[PDB]
Fold ALK tyrosine kinase receptor.
Amino acid sequence: FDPTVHWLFTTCGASGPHGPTQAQCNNAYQNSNLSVEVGSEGPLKGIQIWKVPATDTYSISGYGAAGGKGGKMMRSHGVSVLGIFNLEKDDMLYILVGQQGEDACPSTNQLIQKVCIGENNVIEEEIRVNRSVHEWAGGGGGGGGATYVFKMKDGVPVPLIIAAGGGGRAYGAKTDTFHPERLENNSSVLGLNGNSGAAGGGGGWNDNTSLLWAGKSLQEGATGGHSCPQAMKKWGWETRGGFGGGGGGCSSGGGGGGYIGGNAASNNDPEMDGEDGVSFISPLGILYTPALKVMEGHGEVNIKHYL
Amino acid sequence: TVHWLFTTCGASGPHGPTQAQCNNAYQNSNLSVEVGSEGPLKGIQIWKVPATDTYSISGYGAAGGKGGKNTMMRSHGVSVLGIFNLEKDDMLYILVGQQGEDACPSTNQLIQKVCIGENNVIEEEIRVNRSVHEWAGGGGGGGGATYVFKMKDGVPVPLIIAAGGGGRAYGAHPERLENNSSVLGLNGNSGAAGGGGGWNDNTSLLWAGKSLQEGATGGHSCPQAMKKWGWETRGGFGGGGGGCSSGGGGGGYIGGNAASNNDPEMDGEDGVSFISPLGILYTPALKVMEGHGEVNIKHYLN
């Protein structure tokens, strides 16, 4: 007679810059007590819509996704945030589970794969002569998507919890930089995308995204960024950001998704990782944890309430 | 995915757990500790580092006690998360802060009528006398801080200290973080309620929270509250100050101040937290913890 009722939301087996379909989630959640509606078009595509079963107090935990690895270190992991919220029966919650940023290696392109296995030194040769990489661009990991849980109020999205994604590692990342994690709780702070340079910044909560390599913001559908033009033209080395706003890689790493997306570097410096995104807890809820790093590649959401 | 979660082992109040309490609490877990049985290390959990690695050490201090109105939420303890390089077989010393005691409810029928609002003896004293001297009590105790430290050449060296919350006054602030050990980790001011204990001080007053190096016992309540009607509201283990009508201060690296007089509207202040320059601060200190404290240690993840 355990009174705990628990729902675990996953990516439904989806990966990469785009979220799951209704069919994928039905298969993933078959025979469980979890049923979602997955939008098919517009900015709600791949977002899982869940009907609150009873007026009660719920705990809502989110884990963002990890960033991708570079062509040469530990990936930057997503973070988790948990909050307590009072919901009313028949309320609709909107859940976006972040997906991992793409890794640079391995590759089905034989030339790129020789870079990956350490037999092709063309990038190291270019680096010996330049501050950035300009010709042989690529090899930075994509940013991870953030995980978002939100509701509608009078037709307006209201964020409840956002757990940021990790930034992608640069091609030639060799040390960790130990930048502190940020957690926001003031809805008057602008929830915008991070800086894009050669790699894409992470997507925020509500922005206008125009660049192909930038991660899109949540209210635009949170698609992961493409890679920089030169990586594509030279050898097709594309390292996309993850669904949930991850920025695409160049030789530098893409930014992670969040309430505010992580910044990417201004130039294509092969030692510059993307920054992790910024997490968020609504003042409507009670914060129960700081934003803590979590091991797994893709994100997840855990919801619970007690009979 | 492995981690080590230290709790109060089921202990509450001004005194830390026994070895038997931690053995019971940690049974069937991956955690084994030695708990001091006497001296300034009593109630402090000693843990051997299993492997040379970089670790994250997350400390959470305990919340303060409530006062005479349960609508007034308690002041939550502070979280402090750091990254540290540890060597196999190093010994860490872990004091998990305990919640400050609540004034209410009470087993005493007279005190319980005050708690429910059916006895106005304190309110009448406040009107007639403009201050509480006779019917003292009703303020919550301060919460204990959580302390993680090591010994170096026989001297304690602080790594992470996560402050406790001040107690609410009978008739009822940003997180502060220090990282320079030349700013001395002293107790907070005691008035009628006790100040929180700090890292290293000499505690004289019965109602003051003790400093960490004195054993971190929670303060007694103010003597008049004990004498008049036995309204004892003690600080939590980890340096919480005892309550009077005002609230006790929370433990910390520097203890939280209590008010100068027995003002029934004055909460105790939270303690000051600390992180050593031996570590890296992972995220800003943030008040989060509504009950007892805790410590979570795990292998570092980038």
In short: The longest strand of chain B covers residues 77-86.
